[PDB]
Write an enzyme that holds these catalytic residues in place. Sequence first.
Site, short mmCIF file in Angstrom:
data_model
loop_
_atom_site.label_atom_id
_atom_site.label_comp_id
_atom_site.label_asym_id
_atom_site.label_seq_id
_atom_site.Cartn_x
_atom_site.Cartn_y
_atom_site.Cartn_z
N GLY B 158 0.86 -1.15 0.12
CA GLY B 158 -0.09 0.02 0.02
C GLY B 158 1.01 1.36 0.17
O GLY B 158 0.57 2.34 -0.36
N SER B 209 5.41 4.04 5.15
CA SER B 209 4.88 2.66 5.97
C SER B 209 4.09 3.04 7.28
O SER B 209 4.52 3.81 8.07
CB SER B 209 6.33 1.94 6.78
OG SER B 209 5.87 0.95 7.50
N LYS B 210 3.01 2.60 7.03
CA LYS B 210 1.87 2.88 7.97
C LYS B 210 2.30 2.64 9.40
O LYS B 210 2.08 3.54 10.43
CB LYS B 210 0.56 2.02 7.94
CG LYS B 210 -0.66 2.51 8.57
CD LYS B 210 -1.99 1.78 8.11
CE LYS B 210 -3.04 2.16 8.95
NZ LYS B 210 -4.28 1.69 8.48
N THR B 211 2.91 1.32 9.71
CA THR B 211 3.19 1.03 11.13
C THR B 211 4.59 1.40 11.43
O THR B 211 4.79 1.54 12.29
CB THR B 211 3.21 -0.52 11.16
OG1 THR B 211 4.03 -0.98 10.01
CG2 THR B 211 1.74 -1.12 10.88
N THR B 213 7.21 -0.61 10.68
CA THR B 213 7.75 -1.64 11.32
C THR B 213 7.98 -2.74 10.36
O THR B 213 8.46 -3.82 10.53
CB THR B 213 7.15 -2.31 12.54
OG1 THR B 213 5.88 -2.70 12.17
CG2 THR B 213 7.12 -1.19 13.63
N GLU B 216 10.54 -5.32 4.99
CA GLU B 216 11.26 -5.13 4.12
C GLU B 216 11.57 -3.63 3.94
O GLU B 216 12.51 -2.82 3.78
CB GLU B 216 10.25 -5.15 2.83
CG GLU B 216 9.87 -6.82 2.66
CD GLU B 216 8.88 -7.25 3.39
OE1 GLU B 216 8.24 -8.14 2.60
OE2 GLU B 216 8.35 -6.74 4.46
N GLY B 271 -3.83 0.64 4.26
CA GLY B 271 -2.47 1.00 3.35
C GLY B 271 -3.01 1.02 1.94
O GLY B 271 -2.58 1.73 0.96
N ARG B 272 -3.96 0.13 1.24
CA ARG B 272 -4.29 -0.05 0.28
C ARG B 272 -5.24 1.18 -0.49
O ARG B 272 -5.93 1.23 -1.66
CB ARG B 272 -4.99 -1.33 -0.30
CG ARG B 272 -6.13 -1.81 0.55
CD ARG B 272 -6.44 -3.20 0.44
NE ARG B 272 -7.68 -3.56 1.36
CZ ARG B 272 -7.48 -4.06 2.53
NH1 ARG B 272 -5.91 -4.34 3.03
NH2 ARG B 272 -8.38 -4.27 3.29
N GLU B 357 -6.93 -7.72 -1.62
CA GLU B 357 -6.59 -7.68 -0.20
C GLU B 357 -7.95 -7.39 0.69
O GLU B 357 -7.92 -7.65 1.74
CB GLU B 357 -5.27 -6.88 0.05
CG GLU B 357 -4.76 -6.88 1.49
CD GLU B 357 -3.56 -6.02 1.71
OE1 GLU B 357 -2.49 -6.74 1.63
OE2 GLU B 357 -3.48 -5.06 1.80
N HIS B 388 -1.78 -9.29 -27.52
CA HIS B 388 -0.79 -10.03 -28.03
C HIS B 388 -0.23 -11.27 -27.39
O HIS B 388 0.79 -12.05 -27.64
CB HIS B 388 0.33 -9.44 -28.87
CG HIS B 388 -0.35 -8.15 -29.78
ND1 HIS B 388 -0.91 -8.55 -31.04
CD2 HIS B 388 -0.15 -7.12 -29.91
CE1 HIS B 388 -1.26 -7.52 -31.54
NE2 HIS B 388 -0.89 -6.49 -30.81
N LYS B 518 4.51 -13.50 7.79
CA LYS B 518 5.34 -12.83 8.56
C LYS B 518 5.80 -13.55 9.70
O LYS B 518 7.22 -13.58 9.98
CB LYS B 518 4.75 -11.34 8.98
CG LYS B 518 4.60 -10.39 7.83
CD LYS B 518 3.67 -9.55 8.35
CE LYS B 518 3.05 -8.24 7.26
NZ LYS B 518 2.22 -7.41 7.84
#
Lengths: 556, 556
Positions: B158, B209-211, B213, B216, B271-272, B357, B388, B518
């Site tokens: 997200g 990043s929302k969190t 944490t 990645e 997030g999304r 999601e 194609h 995770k």
Amino acid sequence: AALTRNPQFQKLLEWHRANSANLKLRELFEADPERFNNFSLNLNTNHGHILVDYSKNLVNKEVMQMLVELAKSRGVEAARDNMFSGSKINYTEDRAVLHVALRNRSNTPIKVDGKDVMPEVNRVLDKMKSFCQRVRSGDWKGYTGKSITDIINIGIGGSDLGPLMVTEALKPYSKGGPRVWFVSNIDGTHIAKTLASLSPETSLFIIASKTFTTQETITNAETAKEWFLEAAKDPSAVAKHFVALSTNTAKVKEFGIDPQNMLEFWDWVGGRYSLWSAIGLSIALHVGFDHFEQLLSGAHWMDQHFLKTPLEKNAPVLLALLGIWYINCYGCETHALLPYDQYMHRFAAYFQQGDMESNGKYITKSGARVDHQTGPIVWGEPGTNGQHAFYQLIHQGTKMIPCDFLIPVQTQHPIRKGLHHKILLANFLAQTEALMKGKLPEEARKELQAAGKSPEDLEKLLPHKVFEGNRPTNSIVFTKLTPFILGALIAMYEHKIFVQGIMWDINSFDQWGVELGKQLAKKIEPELEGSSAVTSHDSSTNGLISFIKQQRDTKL
Amino acid sequence: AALTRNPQFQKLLEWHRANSANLKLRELFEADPERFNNFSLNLNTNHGHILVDYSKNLVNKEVMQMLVELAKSRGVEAARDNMFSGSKINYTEDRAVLHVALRNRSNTPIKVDGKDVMPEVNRVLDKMKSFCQRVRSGDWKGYTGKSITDIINIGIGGSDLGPLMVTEALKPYSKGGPRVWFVSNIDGTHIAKTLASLSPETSLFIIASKTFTTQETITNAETAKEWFLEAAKDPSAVAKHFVALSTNTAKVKEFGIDPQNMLEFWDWVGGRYSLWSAIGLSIALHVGFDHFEQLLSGAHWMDQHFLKTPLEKNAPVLLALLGIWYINCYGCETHALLPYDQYMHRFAAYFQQGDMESNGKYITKSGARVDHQTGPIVWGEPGTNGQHAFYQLIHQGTKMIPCDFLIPVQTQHPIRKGLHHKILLANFLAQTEALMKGKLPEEARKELQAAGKSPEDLEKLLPHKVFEGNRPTNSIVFTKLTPFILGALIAMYEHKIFVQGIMWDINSFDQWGVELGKQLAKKIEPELEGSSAVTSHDSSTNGLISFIKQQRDTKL
């Protein structure tokens, strides 16, 4: 249809009906400590290992036996031999199917119409090598006398996806090579945004089209020539900046390309199996001919594996069989390709054509309509990205989705003392384990209790936190994504698709289904020009055209 | 489950059982010259038109009435109003769902916990505006006194897909803006290749990043900071080169960024659904804040359309219902998004997260396990590329695949006096016509006759040339793909997704399904270190780990 009338298929189907609901991956692993050992293939290519671990699948000893028996009784062994020998197995077009000849490093003669194709294959390969030396060394000069810095491949479908995917995947092998660009869409954005980044003095165009009359490719090629000529102002300069991958000498000459720079391929090379041919020129230019030869060698290795190996331990055959199990017994519409490798980011898209255009078929060899499913919808994104996009649905949706997870053990970029790759590997491993094992109510309950959830909140949240698991995967792990190993991997999937097509009694090698849209587009094209209302179609096509004519003059 | 127990759904299903076999698109169109007029919506936004043409679907008046009755009976309108007013409809997380507040240009109050969110939304927007001016003007300087040339978004899912898809789609609006890069994969290739092309002196990193944490994102951000500090050698210089977008101030501080260098969003921003928030910073930096405001405004227009329009003329509602028809009555697993626009090349990938999601769920608001399908698998490539690759299967495979075809009337690049776009439009139009119409045996027979084919050749080829047709599509055509129109299109799909989730009685706004992967990855991480055999898992995970350890030090 041949498949439905086949007794081995009917037995497999009846077994599924009676026993499949019973199959639990957790239980299968619990009952059998040798499970990984007996349901995996560790292939030593002598240029790295490829482990095809199919143990996390909803199969046992009997199921695999039933599947191999089906492959045999559908004629997979005979059909394969027919492919390799130059037989005309593309029966609707009456053509041989010989992408295997393109990478036939052993040079054992393969005859089409009584004539060995290998000399011609090798002659074009020699031309590619010479071409690559000239361009990569800087010896090939543009119209102002400068070395070439950018190569632009112009092509569609099989002339685009293969070269694109492979150059992306083999990017680390491109030191000292020219930048490579791919133009495919007729959408003028594609060529316009490419040309904006280029100098006519240092750009070389590769026009990839067997007929040299492909509308999208030739339109793009002509737009490139117009841009080029605005700067060069000399029609004879075109020959220094345009080459062709084609057999249409007259049309190539007409375009202004020196016929010496027309690299040929044959009717037994399908577009979607063509990167191994002259069509791979942009790959060889980007990474060098040596690396291109290695890619060909990897495919050849896999060709030999497929030709010589008993079916029960034949990698592409087993991949094909597991697919048949999911498609024709479980009714799974899709197959996900999930490479845990950013370089492989176009691997899934490549096999959308390779798989879907091959096996998206409904007429059998006898002319009868299939009464069963054929090729699946293929899709995917690289890991770990997919985990934060759609794995929610894979884990907790209402679809059964067979997934192939792919990864190299060794990374091209071992940054931070391998930390990134350690994490990537751990995710690769964890996801298939998670998909298999799930999370039981008892496991989720302890988590909610430790989180301090009240009695009512706990009971409300619990079912949401449960993972049912029992979602099957393949894990395909290889030493390193080198040109050789990539070649092997692509050939493996090519041969999976082949096996599946034989079992379905369909032609994997024709594409009659693209014709109707082409016919209708040619009819609409001239109708868009004028201001007059178009009434010659159904009311939707007419209504959409009316909207286009009305809105194209609107000033925003 | 609420849906299957619903009498209006039972009526719809039973009607489908009795009558759907008799629905034939070719015949529906022949019998009703008003079909396009009665099954399409032409929306005038005052900044362009969006035509949603749903006439090529397997529906009639009665089917649409039944679908609308179902939406009413499933409480779509009340649920929608609850979303818009700040009710905590994300019931598993006890959160509001207020991406509509992010783009609430009217500034009408939306309260969470008795407090208007609009002042804080607008405060962050003002900070974004100010920051973008400082960067794009060249005023903001790096640690050596140079203007910023490159923006690097670090984030995943997200925090990546939205900004990436929008900057790609709105590329013509970025002239004079800094280059933008997206790093998302943990795979070290991603950051390594990006950093190889950058200078620490002129690069601005956005850690999204929302969190704050996410493994990645934090790992990537730490690698970036290490690379930066290797050059800058000055911890205070981090403030000139790193900006955080998060809800988690404490973790941002922990990483080493001051809240002054942080733009916040809120827990009610999924997030999304987050590109409209601070997460859209990289969009605003690239195309400018004015164009970012127009994107927000277009979404707002669509928000108001969804809020204020009766169900039977409501665009996202009708799209959602057609989906329900194909998913829950026809049993179609997938939905294809096919924008005939190269700039929109990542639109399908964005909606893989947005849709899959959100609605890849199996537990209802009551705690019931669904006994019916939920969200589909979303996929696609832009036309004519996808055309194609895989259309062979759409035309002539064995899967029903609802497709949305999308195109702007006006191209951003009217090269060759409009020739490329004319061809693009012709293909967009012809493909849906072809999918609808097909080609009958008798029509293909006549074509083969005219082609000079012998009765022998004709009869063997005939069935392969037949197109069964009756393959349903939506065509969505809009004046031009401006920031406003793109914003309206994204919101439209967000609301289609919402309506479907309500009708399925699921929570479109949580994602418990990503947790297990995770957890299992964090367990595997330390086991990869050292040479010892791992025996703690199932034999497949164990066996893959052994392979990884064995192959780690192979010198290829």
